[PDB]
Write a protein that binds this DNA or RNA. Sequence first.
RNA 1: GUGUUCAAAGCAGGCCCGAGCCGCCUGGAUACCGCAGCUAGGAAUAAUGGAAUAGGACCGCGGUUCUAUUUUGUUGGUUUU
Length: 66
Amino acid sequence: DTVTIRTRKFMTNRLLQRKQMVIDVLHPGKATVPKTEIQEKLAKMYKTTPDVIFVFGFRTHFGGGK
RNA sequence: GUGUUCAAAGCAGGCCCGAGCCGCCUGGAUACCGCAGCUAGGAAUAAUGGAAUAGGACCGCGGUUCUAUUUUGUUGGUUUU
């Protein structure tokens, strides 16, 4: 809910042939909607079939929210 | 520098764009160096120098003499400055 992947510091990694960015998602009261959702959500942002979108990170911010 | 939610701390960090911003962006300072040395300014202070039965400055020079090598095209010879 109210997810909004905020692609901060987007890096067209040309020598690793990829889109490289920081995922920064928002929440009402429950942090960290699941990773493969975020893949599928970052899929439809970029239309890139998200099983090539290999995400990680995803630590839950205190107070839900982000 | 830096909101680690304060803090112990870290070296961080911050954005806009919907997510084509295909990115933009701060940064990660400065302080310390036993000595000995080095460096170069000082020359007080503390030591420190000389002319004494004369020495120091002036090409004062003098006469002697050693020898060093440039030119005499060159070398060789000697000769000198």
